[PDB]
Write a structure and sequence with these properties.
The structure is cut from a larger assembly and holds 2 copies of chain A (131 residues), 1 copy of chain B (204 residues) and 2 copies of chain C (311 residues). Chain A has 131 residues and is mainly α. Chain A is globular. Chain A has 5 helices and 3 strands; from the N terminus they run E-H-E-E-H-H-H-H. The two termini of chain A are 24 Å apart. Chain A has a two-stranded antiparallel sheet. In chain A, helix 4 runs antiparallel to helix 5. The longest helix of chain A is centred in the last third of the chain and has 19 residues. Chain B is α/β, with parallel strands linked by helices. Chain B has a single domain, classed as Rossmann fold (3-Layer(aba) Sandwich). Chain B has 6 helices and 9 strands. In chain B, the strands form 2 sheets. Chain B has a 7-stranded mixed β-sheet, with helices on both faces. Chain B has a two-stranded antiparallel ribbon with strand order 1-8. In chain B, helix 4 links the parallel strand 3 and strand 4. The radius of gyration of chain B is 18 Å and the shape is globular. Chain C folds into 2 domains: 139 residues, Rossmann fold; 129 residues, Rossmann fold (3-Layer(aba) Sandwich). In chain C, the strands form 3 sheets. Chain C has a 5-stranded parallel β-sheet with strand order 9-8-5-10-11, with helices on both faces. Chain C has 10 helices and 11 strands. Classes of the chains: A mainly alpha (131), B alpha/beta (204), C alpha/beta (311). Chains in contact: A-D, A-E, B-C, B-D, C-D, D-E. Strand 3 of chain A pairs parallel with strand 1 of chain E, so a sheet runs across the interface. The structure holds magnesium ion (2 copies). The site of one magnesium ion has 6 residues of chain C, from loops.
Amino acid sequence: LHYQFADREDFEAKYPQIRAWVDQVNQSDEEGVVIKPRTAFLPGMPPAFKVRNNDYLTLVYGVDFQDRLQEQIAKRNIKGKLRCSINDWAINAKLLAIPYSELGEENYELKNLVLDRILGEEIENQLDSRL
Amino acid sequence: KSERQFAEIKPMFEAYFKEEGLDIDFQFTDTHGSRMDFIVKELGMEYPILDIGCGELKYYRRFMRRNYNYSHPYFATDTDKSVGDYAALLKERMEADNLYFFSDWTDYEYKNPVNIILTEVIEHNTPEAAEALVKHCLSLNFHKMIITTPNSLFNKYYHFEWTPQEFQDFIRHCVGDTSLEVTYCGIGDRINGETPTQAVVITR
Amino acid sequence: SAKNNTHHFPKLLILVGAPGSGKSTFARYFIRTEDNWVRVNRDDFRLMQFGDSLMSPFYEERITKMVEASVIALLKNRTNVIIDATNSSLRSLQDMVHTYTEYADISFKVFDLPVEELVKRCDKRCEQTGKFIPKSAIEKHVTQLQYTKEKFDFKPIPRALKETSLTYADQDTSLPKAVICDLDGTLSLLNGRDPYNASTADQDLLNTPVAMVLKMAKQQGYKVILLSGRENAYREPTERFLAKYQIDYDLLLMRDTNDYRKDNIIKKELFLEEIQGKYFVEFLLDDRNQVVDMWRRELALPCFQVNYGDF
Amino acid sequence: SAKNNTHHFPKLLILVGAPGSGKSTFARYFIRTEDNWVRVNRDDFRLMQFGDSLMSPFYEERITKMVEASVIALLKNRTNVIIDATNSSLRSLQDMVHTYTEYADISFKVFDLPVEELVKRCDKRCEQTGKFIPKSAIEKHVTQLQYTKEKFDFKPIPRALKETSLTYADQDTSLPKAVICDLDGTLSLLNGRDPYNASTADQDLLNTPVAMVLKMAKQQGYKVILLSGRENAYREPTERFLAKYQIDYDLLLMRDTNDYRKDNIIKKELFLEEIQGKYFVEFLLDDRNQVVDMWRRELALPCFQVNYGDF
Amino acid sequence: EDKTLIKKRIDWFCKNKINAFSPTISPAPKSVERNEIESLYEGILWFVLNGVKEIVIEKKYMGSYCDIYLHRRLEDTYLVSRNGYKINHLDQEQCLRALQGLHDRFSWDGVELRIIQSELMPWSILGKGLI
Ligand SMILES: [Mg+2]
Ligand SMILES: [Mg+2]
């Protein structure tokens, strides 16, 4: 799907269509759906939001998931994962901006950019594993 | 988890084995920790110590317990050249300090008395090569030497492994007619008079 | 007279305040309008390490040794230093005055701003650069001042040289009188020899004046004790040198071969096992900084430094 | 041994390259992955003075005295230091190695990449911030390396310590032998007295080991010369002090009353008008740092420091 | 996080000529209201209120994230994982064959390499991911 909304109440109107479509993404293949902005990299924006169908979540969270739903929901907190997802993509932009030719064991700007990314992996690894 | 949790349970265990023939005296610390205590107790702090087969220098970090005031150099050897690198990695300053590591016995020149620790090193290379090492150490200017090897008569509860007779014959061949005081003793849990590691305290 | 020979000393101005209280902003106008002034600033030392704020205890400890090394180097040069106080907490604020008071007329300017005009320029600052200071860490600081503000007057405190009065250890004077002398760099000028490879020391040069002290002290009850940090291995090029110059002596003490510890602590160990309780030390003659510091500071003995140490 | 006593010292790393060559960018990755390292950086010192780029010759020499005082403070602390080469030339590159090689194993990394996209990374570093670097100023730098790259090896300079061969001034040995002793802080212990108001020196204390060198020096051919920075006004609290403590002496030399020149130069001037060429000095006994340097360095005499100067 | 492991990992990141690095992806915000822990609605909405009005919605597939360094010379193509890692432990020809479907979708006129974000199937062959 591709959408441009212009105003928040156009969004309101086409939602039920979009909702109905991802509603059918249910076969064994599919973690679920992902939401990206048209432009792949924007300042301060995350690359995407995943939205996993109930059947797949049941796998990450366990067989008691529906029975335990309001619980899990209350426990859910994406504010930290979202920040890392954002910073993580921002590093990648800089890593990509580095010219392939210049990739090498003494490109100490590349080495920095990586060490940065590596550090932010150790951070994003301590978060709720089911995200 | 505690030694007075232990103290309260030890009688119960000992009794259990008494009506199974076995006269067991349990100890709380693991076999290794018993070894470390015996040596440290026996050698004391008054002479500089020589740690042969010092490995990860676990005996080093014990003598440097602030409590003890180790006011000497500390000599160490391992032939294993991975330890080789580790010692040299405390010229990271992390403490030289008084360490002196050597892998070539011709690089040890200290002529004053030392105490000598030979823990569980004589069975991580050959008996011919063990003799060679021990015989060397007994030539050096030492006060006390402690040699430690497992007691094989204990292996029945689970390079080469020596019996108490075998070990005592080894020490005798290495001391020969020199004039030393040689003392044996077990270290660790004592089942029917037999312990899991056996030891000598050779004294000048 | 004395009333009219008076000397003047560099000024140190310490800027006491909460983050946001306009400490920096004052210094910027100060060192541009007043005259002999250099600023020292801790955050900038952080930037050198590519960290933006508060770092590892590692870096942070070292940065201090840098700050103090810098303030003093500047102060010694008869240059005025303006520096931000490290905190407002009385005792670090005292620690500062200890450190620097040998060196300068200290003065203070406090930046006492109300708690919410401190946030209203901390959240107009923290839009500027990357940094941030919450409304927690500001207030441990604002009230912290209001308390230490109350139990200390930010009065000018003129240069204090405190003369640790020279007090020697108490010795049993009935013991025999003796002087103790170093070899390497003191009685023996090693003269291009290897410091550590003393195998050729029988061809060193004689520090003639020190020799004439030992040669004079032995013309009295004084036993002349030589205590060298040279390995005992090299003991025979050594008493070859000594006899060569008729430097007779009662006792030559040397470093255990293969010891290799810092040469102060083996000398101190040497002193206690072999000299203390058995002699009366009038004074000692050594050369090396580390070792003279040992003698003077750890054992409280008279030690006359012969030439420059600092190695 | 020497083969087998090897000693280890902090490393100092020097970063040689024109601006844009990745000096910082490397250091940023370096101090994060290697382990015992603090970076010292000149530019960051500028910012403490709120200068963006090169400042007054005032600030600039002062900024240096801070930089080396910091690099050394860190090196002395057995901590490794990384610095950008200062001028990137040859001779300042030498000044660096001169200043610092006593303290550390020096080594270098050169960042020698081309002038036309040294401009293409200097003109992308000069718009994040402000700045400008003319492809003139960057051009002074690329070749200045190319000449010094050409006549200087950038491979390691292991800690070189260097002993000054102690060579005394030549004294006409025909003269009578005499020893020279300071008063304030050497033979006469002030014990809270005013340094400048020597009117109560009649109630000073006696530094016994020094007194015992003078009391022994005269029990030999030695004439005892006392050379004080005390104003001559206070001469009878002084030979009251002297008489009180059985300190017999041949010659008391003192500061012209109302002189007030710094006490280095009035002691040196006194030496030439009242002692030099007319006596033979075996050695001198003084205390104050400033003055000892004087005897030792300027007049090249044996001078034994009794306690700590640094005032 | 041992300095020496990071260092050599990066050294290899440089030798292997890697020029990109994946982000972690956050779930969409919960909607207690809509009784779902990752909400399709609250997620797209988030983008809107942040001034992003043009968005995409793909289906996320059960597979491993890999970056294909699609060299024009298809022999030269290698794979890197969600981390900074060359994917060697696969028969480079079965891999390359599956990769050729793709290869023929491009004009390789003065184009030496396209770096392409992809999912590998099943999650099985590579790592495991959820097992
Ligand atoms: Mg010396
Ligand atoms: Mg004086």
